[PDB]
Design an enzyme around this catalytic site. Structure first.
Site, PDB file in Angstrom:
ATOM      1  N   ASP A  79      66.593   2.191   8.120  1.00 48.95           N
ATOM      2  CA  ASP A  79      67.136   1.239   7.148  1.00 48.95           C
ATOM      3  C   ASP A  79      68.031   1.928   6.124  1.00 48.95           C
ATOM      4  O   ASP A  79      67.785   1.890   4.918  1.00 48.95           O
ATOM      5  CB  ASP A  79      66.031   0.442   6.442  1.00 48.95           C
ATOM      6  CG  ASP A  79      65.757  -0.900   7.086  1.00 48.95           C
ATOM      7  OD1 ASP A  79      65.082  -1.716   6.422  1.00 48.95           O
ATOM      8  OD2 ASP A  79      66.200  -1.142   8.237  1.00 48.95           O
TER       9      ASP A  79
ATOM     10  N   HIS B 169      59.189   2.173  11.286  1.00 44.49           N
ATOM     11  CA  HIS B 169      59.790   1.274  10.306  1.00 44.49           C
ATOM     12  C   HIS B 169      59.011  -0.004  10.083  1.00 44.49           C
ATOM     13  O   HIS B 169      58.733  -0.356   8.945  1.00 44.49           O
ATOM     14  CB  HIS B 169      61.228   0.917  10.670  1.00 44.49           C
ATOM     15  CG  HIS B 169      61.895   0.041   9.653  1.00 44.49           C
ATOM     16  ND1 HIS B 169      62.215   0.483   8.386  1.00 44.49           N
ATOM     17  CD2 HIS B 169      62.303  -1.253   9.714  1.00 44.49           C
ATOM     18  CE1 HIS B 169      62.786  -0.497   7.711  1.00 44.49           C
ATOM     19  NE2 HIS B 169      62.855  -1.562   8.492  1.00 44.49           N
TER      20      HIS B 169
ATOM     21  N   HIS C 111      59.010  -1.089   6.014  1.00 44.65           N
ATOM     22  CA  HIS C 111      60.055  -2.066   5.951  1.00 44.65           C
ATOM     23  C   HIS C 111      60.138  -3.231   4.945  1.00 44.65           C
ATOM     24  O   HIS C 111      61.067  -4.044   4.969  1.00 44.65           O
ATOM     25  CB  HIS C 111      60.282  -2.338   7.467  1.00 44.65           C
ATOM     26  CG  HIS C 111      60.460  -3.763   7.873  1.00 44.65           C
ATOM     27  ND1 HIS C 111      61.698  -4.306   8.145  1.00 44.65           N
ATOM     28  CD2 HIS C 111      59.556  -4.721   8.172  1.00 44.65           C
ATOM     29  CE1 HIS C 111      61.552  -5.554   8.548  1.00 44.65           C
ATOM     30  NE2 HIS C 111      60.262  -5.834   8.565  1.00 44.65           N
TER      31      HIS C 111
ATOM     32  N   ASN D 119      65.105  -1.709  11.457  1.00 38.50           N
ATOM     33  CA  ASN D 119      65.687  -2.976  11.879  1.00 38.50           C
ATOM     34  C   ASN D 119      67.118  -3.228  11.379  1.00 38.50           C
ATOM     35  O   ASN D 119      67.792  -4.140  11.851  1.00 38.50           O
ATOM     36  CB  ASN D 119      64.774  -4.131  11.461  1.00 38.50           C
ATOM     37  CG  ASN D 119      64.713  -4.327   9.944  1.00 38.50           C
ATOM     38  OD1 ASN D 119      64.984  -5.433   9.464  1.00 38.50           O
ATOM     39  ND2 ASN D 119      64.361  -3.260   9.178  1.00 38.50           N
ATOM     40  N   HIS D 120      67.593  -2.449  10.412  1.00 38.77           N
ATOM     41  CA  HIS D 120      68.981  -2.639   9.973  1.00 38.77           C
ATOM     42  C   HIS D 120      69.955  -1.758  10.738  1.00 38.77           C
ATOM     43  O   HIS D 120      71.156  -1.936  10.618  1.00 38.77           O
ATOM     44  CB  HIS D 120      69.139  -2.458   8.467  1.00 38.77           C
ATOM     45  CG  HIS D 120      68.582  -3.588   7.666  1.00 38.77           C
ATOM     46  ND1 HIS D 120      69.367  -4.385   6.864  1.00 38.77           N
ATOM     47  CD2 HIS D 120      67.320  -4.063   7.548  1.00 38.77           C
ATOM     48  CE1 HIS D 120      68.614  -5.298   6.277  1.00 38.77           C
ATOM     49  NE2 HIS D 120      67.369  -5.126   6.677  1.00 38.77           N
TER      50      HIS D 120
ATOM     51  N   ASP E  23      62.864   2.686   3.057  1.00 38.99           N
ATOM     52  CA  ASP E  23      64.237   2.143   3.115  1.00 38.99           C
ATOM     53  C   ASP E  23      65.153   2.747   2.065  1.00 38.99           C
ATOM     54  O   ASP E  23      64.690   3.145   0.993  1.00 38.99           O
ATOM     55  CB  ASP E  23      64.211   0.619   2.921  1.00 38.99           C
ATOM     56  CG  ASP E  23      63.399  -0.102   3.988  1.00 38.99           C
ATOM     57  OD1 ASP E  23      63.354  -1.340   3.976  1.00 38.99           O
ATOM     58  OD2 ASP E  23      62.819   0.568   4.854  1.00 38.99           O
TER      59      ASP E  23
ATOM     60  N   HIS F 142      69.019   1.665   2.229  1.00 36.79           N
ATOM     61  CA  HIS F 142      70.026   0.610   2.140  1.00 36.79           C
ATOM     62  C   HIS F 142      71.237   0.905   1.264  1.00 36.79           C
ATOM     63  O   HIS F 142      71.495   0.196   0.301  1.00 36.79           O
ATOM     64  CB  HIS F 142      69.380  -0.700   1.690  1.00 36.79           C
ATOM     65  CG  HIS F 142      68.446  -1.297   2.698  1.00 36.79           C
ATOM     66  ND1 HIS F 142      68.889  -1.955   3.826  1.00 36.79           N
ATOM     67  CD2 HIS F 142      67.093  -1.350   2.740  1.00 36.79           C
ATOM     68  CE1 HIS F 142      67.850  -2.382   4.521  1.00 36.79           C
ATOM     69  NE2 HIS F 142      66.749  -2.033   3.880  1.00 36.79           N
TER      70      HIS F 142
HETATM   71 MN   LIG Z   1      63.349  -3.279   7.380  1.00 34.65          MN
HETATM   72 MN   LIG Z   2      64.798  -2.973   4.478  1.00 32.40          MN
END
Ligand SMILES: [Mn+2]
Ligand SMILES: [Mn+2]
Lengths: 47, 7, 403, 303, 583
Positions: free
Chosen positions: D84, D166, D240, D116-117, D56, D58
């Site tokens: 992500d 992920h 994740h 998932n993001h 990730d 972010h």
């Molecule tokens: Mn995730």
């Molecule tokens: Mn994440």
């Protein structure tokens, strides 16, 4: 002591698969509801 | 610890 | 015995003025910390169950005991500051001297709550100066401290009419600095809880001072980024004023419209939620004054691509009372709401709100059959308005060669 | 045979390396170009043997810069990102647009998977949506990026041996071919295999179990072992879940969690990591800390 | 369309509901004005913007900005006072950012006012604002005093002083804060014996305010105040107030003092520094509050470097040094961090023997600190120490610790040492370097982090520049080429990155004979990344070679790569051929 764990094992593919199947079914029912909602709208438009 | 969806 | 009791009490107050180090040297003085801990512990139990002990000389001795223990400068923030931090996500950093601090708080409270407590005798010692330093303490990082302070200042407000004006003016100052200078303060919620209870106490033909206070202090509290921390208690304060005097609703609703978040979604949901609670008290007469600007916003929200903004807006339709005010005003509201939820009926990324706009459109036609799709008739009136616009600027620019 | 566009791309990339967003019409063009290359990539992308694999990110641009300082510059070393890219950080716009940028300039050198993001819903409750709004003044760039997320492959396969994704595994999935058979060109569904793959977590409860996240499933060692044996995989590589050492082995080393955002949300205090797979597929992890971080804002009711 | 047509259009545009459209109008407000007369601007547009404008904070913000640039449009300096009514209103507006622009605009245009106009229009504006009902008007006023004052009559100056005094004693801390903010600014504009007689009292009162947020602003002011004033007045006036702030109950106040400390030392001058600022500083280095201790630590070398020529030794060696020693083992990472970043600059001040005796053990305890930031900050300034003590002495006392840090756990520490190697090696000399330090530098090239590899690579070029090309041929080159057979493509590219750099300074011969052959063999590496770097690398070293070599050896290989299966190899080959003009 073995078969017991082995049972819980099979019992779990079983339940998960089923959960995933019911979840599938709520989503399909939600699509019916959206369509019908659309239909109520189109029909009330011509009142 | 911020919010389960993830600190 | 009947007397040397009063001397021994004062003697112990003195010994509780000795401050101990819990931070710098965390392993020091264990034994003497306990001595102090026990010393004020018994003093609570002492003043709690017994009676007629709040004699004239112990007043200054108590107030001084409090001040020396409570009134320090708060340490540097333990939390990072900046635009990328949500104060909601700040690690709880606790007051390490809480062993003693709690019991000073717990004590000074029982000292206040005694039915043998004499205000106009204590007032020599609980003065504006004391209040100001007490007010400073609300920025403490420790929620338990803020909690006690809330209750303490709330009592002081109740028992000293002399101090009420000062306390009002002083917390106002705290807010102004928060809203207009720093945008950081840990105790906004707590101060508002006190203020909430204070709003209820207010008198019948609302005084100008407090009207000003709502419009100039409480409303602008809405514009600061960290609204989520204290919004419930803020919303409460606002709602109470409106209950106390309905003529205030136009300015407040006009203000919330004025401050509507353009780049902060959680706040958009927060406003929508607060406004509904407001509509739950709206006299119809006050509703007619603000419907159109209100719904020009709700139109924007309903068509919002942000599912949490759209949803919360659309949830207004599950409100029987709002829904009826729409009904017997349908003339004005529907031509402004309609284009919005029509543009979003053909298609939507989110199925739930797709479902909710179909339902919403249904409830509108059931109010007054409106086959009024002179919606695109307006879409032309706007094309012409734009052609007149661009042809006006032409004249202005070609008149720059000037006189 | 004209490289007028690769001059334009090289500029966009250079700009982005200075943490400066592209413009609305540049993102729109970028995503348009990005879609056409991603659409021809498989649900389980075949990835060539020497690569560096990342968790990730972010929106923590400065830590991504730090990642490249450890890993090597974004052409010279091959990278695989496991999703992500967009939420909790302060620089999601710069981060995703840079990573997409790199992918369209160097489709062969970088692979980016869906996390998932990368989804309309998640991107709205967490930062990205509001970031786009304060950086552009409207929801267009968001629309372009989210439309673009539907096209991101779900999983990667390095050398027929290291499965990369992920989330984790799915009860509806037993083979890669099950995965190849999915239709990924859509918003991440609330239930189903596509969802599980981006949401699930391994755990220590030796079977399928309810995820504490409202989605996917937890899964224990025996699933991993079956799944690996059935597909002839030596390792499941996934990304994740925050891990304090930046990377974590579990399930008798059938799975690894890699996590590439150090001190997550600038709160969590975790180390970050990436994993290098060399020419002969031997692994090695590199941990790293957050990079040295060297008025009164505009009111949120302005625009 | 007639005379006031452009105003009608503006009205229409401000009647709009798209806030954005209203903004575009305001942005084009000088075009309106040009369209209109100069006199229609004055007697019609201006009044319109004064009375007839109620709107959102964003629009008011734009209007503020526009009005700051309208002097010519309204008829020039003869007429600037026209702009004041609009701006007075905007200065009263609740939102901080709008009223701030308003002030900025007011300050700007004041310079266009004749002293008469300043007296008849501008000063009255400052009075109304300063005596207004709300704290917003009053805070705005604080920003306006120092632009009108120097240019008005003494009677008016006496009035401005009174008003400024009233603001300093507002009931609200909001105004008192904003006043203390502008006290220095104001002082710098007063006649000097007014500084003495009227500013000192204002400053003294703010410096003992109940709110510490006001008090700490008075410290900033004290600096401006001390700088305007000579040795003798300081002692009576500002000094007893200054000595208080250093002992303030609020660490926030004590922090300003510490932060402004050298600036205070200058301002005050060496005499008072010795008597007053020495004890204070010691106490500040011993503060219960770490941010204070950190702040003060940052100033340790500056302070010392500015002590008077005579007592300089006594005070440093007897007063300050033992504090420094204490601070070296402070509990707090950050106060230790601050010190580590300035302590070495003490060396040229204590001289050779003192440094070796007292400073050196400290450096060593910081060279081995547990906090990476401490040890990073203490590498920074090593050369300054090498200048005071010997290079002979350096390699005996510190080199062993430096070698240890070359293999530190945190790469930024490793990098600090790398960037210092070239200079250090120059001073030790080749026979020492490549007996004791060669392998250490070579190891860096093979380090897990790229940045370290990268740094160690340009480091090579710096080394060859002081040791020359034949030390390179015998010492560097063959290990560098050895890397072309590393099983890992990541280390193989290092060989190319090294050649890129080394060619620049090894000259044609060495490059052609000993490096080029390795580059050309790599063109057949199994991994594309290596391959396209062979292209980039041939581009780079191409100019160094003879056209015959270029032509018989380089060209064929580049062309072979243009046939490569991989898009990036093909691209970078085509590129090298263009640049070298082999296409
Ligand atoms: Mn995730
Ligand atoms: Mn994440």
């Amino acid at each position: 002591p073995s078969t017991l764990l082995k049972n819980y094992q099979d019992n779990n593919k079983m339940l998960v698969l089923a959960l995933e199947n019911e979840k599938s079914k709520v989503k399909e029912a939600q699509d019916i509801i959206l369509q019908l909602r659309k239909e109520c709208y189109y029909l009330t438009c011509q009142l | 610890x911020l919010x389960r969806x993830x600190x | 015995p009947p007397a040397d009791q009063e001397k021994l009490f004062i003697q112990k107050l003195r010994q509780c003025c000795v401050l101990f180090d819990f931070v710098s040297d965390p392993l020091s003085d264990l034994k003497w910390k306990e001595v102090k801990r026990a010393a004020l512990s018994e003093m609570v139990e002492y003043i709690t169950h017994n009676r007629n002990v709040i004699t004239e000389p112990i007043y200054p001795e108590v107030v001084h005991m409090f001040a020396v223990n409570m009134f320090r400068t708060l340490p540097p923030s333990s939390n990072p500051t900046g635009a990328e931090f949500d104060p909601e996500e700040d690690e709880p950093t606790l007051e390490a001297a809480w062993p003693h601090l709690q019991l000073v708080y717990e004590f000074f409270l029982r000292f206040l709550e005694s039915p043998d407590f004499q205000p106009n005798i204590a007032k020599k010692y609980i003065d504006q100066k004391f209040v100001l330093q007490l007010l400073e303490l609300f920025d403490s990082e420790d929620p338990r401290e803020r909690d006690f302070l809330k209750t303490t200042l709330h009592r002081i407000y109740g028992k000293f009419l002399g101090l009420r004006a000062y306390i009002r003016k002083q917390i106002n100052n705290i807010f102004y600095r928060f809203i207009y200078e720093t945008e950081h303060h840990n105790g906004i919620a707590e101060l508002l809880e006190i203020l909430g209870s204070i709003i209820n106490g207010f008198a019948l033909p609302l005084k100008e001072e407090h009207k000003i206070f709502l419009l100039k202090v409480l409303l602008p509290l809405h514009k600061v980024k960290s609204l989520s921390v204290y919004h419930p208690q803020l919303a409460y304060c606002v709602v109470q004023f409106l209950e106390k005097d309905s003529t205030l609703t136009e300015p407040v609703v006009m203000a919330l419209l004025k401050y509507w978040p353009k780049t902060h979604s959680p706040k958009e949901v927060m406003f929508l939620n607060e406004l509904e609670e407001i509509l739950d008290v709206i006299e119809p007469s006050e509703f007619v004054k603000i419907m159109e600007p209100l719904f020009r916003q709700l139109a924007k929200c309903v068509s919002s691509p942000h599912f949490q903004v759209a949803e919360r807006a659309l949830y207004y339709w599950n409100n029987e009372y709002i829904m009826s005010l729409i009904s017997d005003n349908a003339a004005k509201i529907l031509p402004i709401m309609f284009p919005s939820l029509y543009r979003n009926s053909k298609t939507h990324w989110n199925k739930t709100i797709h479902g909710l706009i179909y339902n919403a459109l249904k409830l509108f036609m059931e109010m007054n059959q409106k086959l009024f799709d002179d919606c695109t008739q307006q879409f032309k009136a706007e094309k012409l308005k734009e052609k007149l616009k661009m042809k006006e600027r032409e004249e202005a620019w070609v008149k720059i060669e000037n006189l | 045979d004209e490289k007028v566009f690769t001059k334009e791309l090289d500029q966009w990339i250079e700009q982005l390396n200075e943490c400066k967003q592209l413009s609305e019409s540049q993102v729109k063009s970028l995503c348009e170009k990005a879609k056409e290359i991603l659409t021809k990539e498989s649900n389980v992308q075949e990835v060539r043997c020497p690569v560096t694999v990342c968790g990730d990110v972010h929106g923590q641009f400065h830590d991504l810069m730090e990642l490249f300082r450890i890993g090597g510059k974004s052409p010279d070393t091959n990278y695989l990102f496991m999703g992500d890219y967009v939420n909790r950080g302060y620089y999601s716009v710069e981060t995703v647009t840079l990573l997409v940028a790199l992918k369209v300039r160097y489709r062969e050198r970088i692979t980016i998977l869906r996390g998932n993001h990368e989804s309309r819903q998640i991107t709205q409750v967490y930062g990205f949506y509001d970031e786009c709004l304060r950086k552009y003044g409207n929801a267009n760039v968001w629309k372009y990026f989210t439309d673009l997320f539907d096209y991101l492959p779900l999983t990667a396969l390095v050398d027929g041996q290291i499965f990369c994704l992920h989330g984790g595994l799915s009860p509806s999935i037993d083979t890669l071919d099950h995965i190849r058979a999915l239709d990924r060109l859509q918003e991440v569904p609330h239930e189903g295999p596509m969802c599980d793959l981006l949401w699930s977590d391994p755990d220590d409860r030796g079977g399928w179990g309810i995820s504490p996240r409202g989605a996917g499933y937890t899964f224990g060692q025996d699933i991993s072992e079956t799944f690996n044996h059935a597909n002839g995989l030596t390792l499941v590589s996934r990304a994740h879940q925050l891990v304090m050492e930046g990377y974590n082995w579990c399930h008798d080393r059938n799975v690894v969690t890699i996590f590439s955002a150090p001190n997550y949300c600038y709160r969590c205090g975790n180390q970050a990591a990436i994993m290098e797979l060399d020419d002969t597929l031997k692994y090695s992890f590199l941990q790293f800390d957050p990079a040295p971080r060297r008025t009164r804002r505009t009111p949120d009711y302005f625009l | 369309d007639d005379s006031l047509y452009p105003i009608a259009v503006l009205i229409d545009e401000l009647r709009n509901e798209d806030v954005q459209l209203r903004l575009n109008s305001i942005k084009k407000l000088s075009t309106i004005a040009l369209a209109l007369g100069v006199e229609r601007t004055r007697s019609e547009l201006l009044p319109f913007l004064t009375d007839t404008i109620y709107d959102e904070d964003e629009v008011l913000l734009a209007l503020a900005e526009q009005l700051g640039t309208f002097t010519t449009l309204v008829g020039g300096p003869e007429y600037v006072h026209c702009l004041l009514p609009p701006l007075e209103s905007l200065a009263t507006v609740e939102e901080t950012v709008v009223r701030d622009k308003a002030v900025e605009s007011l300050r700007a245009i004041s310079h266009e006012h004749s002293p008469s106009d300043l007296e008849a229009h501008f000063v009255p504006l400052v009075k109304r604002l300063a005596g207004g009902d709300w704290f917003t008007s009053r805070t705005s006023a604080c920003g306006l005093f120092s632009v009108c004052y120097p240019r008005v009559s003494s009677a008016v100056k006496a009035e401005l002083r009174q008003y400024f005094r009233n603001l300093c004693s507002d009931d609200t801390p909001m105004v008192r804060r904003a006043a203390a903010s502008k006290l220095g600014e104001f002082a710098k504009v007063l006649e000097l014996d007014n500084v003495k007689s009227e500013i000192i009292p204002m400053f003294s009162n703010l410096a003992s305010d109940e709110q510490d947020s006001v008090r700490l602003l008075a410290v900033e002011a004290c600096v401006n105040i001390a700088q305007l004033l000579p040795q003798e007045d300081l002692e009576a006036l500002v000094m007893p107030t200054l000595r208080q702030a250093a002992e303030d109950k609020s660490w926030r106040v004590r922090y300003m003092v510490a932060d402004k400390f050298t600036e205070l030392q200058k301002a005050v001058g060496p005499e008072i520094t010795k008597t007053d600022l020495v004890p204070a500083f010691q106490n500040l280095m011993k503060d219960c509050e770490a941010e204070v201790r950190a702040a003060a630590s940052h100033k340790v070398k500056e302070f010392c470097e500015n002590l008077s020529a005579d007592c300089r030794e006594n005070v440093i060696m007897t007063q300050i040094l033992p504090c420094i020693k204490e601070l070296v083992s402070d509990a707090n990472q950050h106060v230790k961090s601050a010190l580590a970043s300035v302590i070495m600059g003490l060396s040229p001040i204590l001289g050779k023997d003192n440094t070796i005796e007292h400073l050196l053990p400290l450096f060593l305890a910081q060279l081995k600190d547990e906090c990476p930031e401490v040890r990073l900050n203490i590498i920074s300034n090593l050369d300054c120490v090498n200048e005071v003590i010997g290079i002979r002495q350096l390699s005996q006392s510190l080199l062993p610790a430096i070698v240890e840090l070359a293999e530190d756990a945190k790469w930024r520490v490793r990098l600090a040492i790398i960037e210092y190697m070239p200079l250090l090696a120059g001073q030790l000399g080749v026979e020492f370097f490549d007996e004791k330090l060669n392998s250490l530098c070579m190891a860096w090239l093979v380090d897990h982090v790229y940045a370290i590899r990268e740094a160690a690579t340009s480091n090579l070029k710096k080394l060859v520049e002081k040791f020359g090309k034949e030390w390179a041929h015998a010492t560097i080159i063959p290990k560098v080429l050895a890397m072309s057979g590393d099983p890992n493509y990541l280390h193989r590219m290092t060989t190319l990155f090294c050649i890129n750099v080394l060619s620049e300074v090894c000259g044609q011969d060495i490059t052609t004979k000993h490096m080029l052959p390795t580059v050309l063999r790599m063109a057949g590496d199994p991994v594309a990344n290596v391959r396209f770097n062979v292209a980039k690398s041939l581009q780079k070293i191409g100019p160094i070679l003879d056209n015959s070599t270029l032509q018989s050896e380089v060209k064929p290989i580049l062309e072979k790569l243009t046939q490569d299966q991989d898009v990036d190899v093909k691209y970078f080959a085509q590129e090298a051929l263009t640049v070298l003009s082999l296409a």
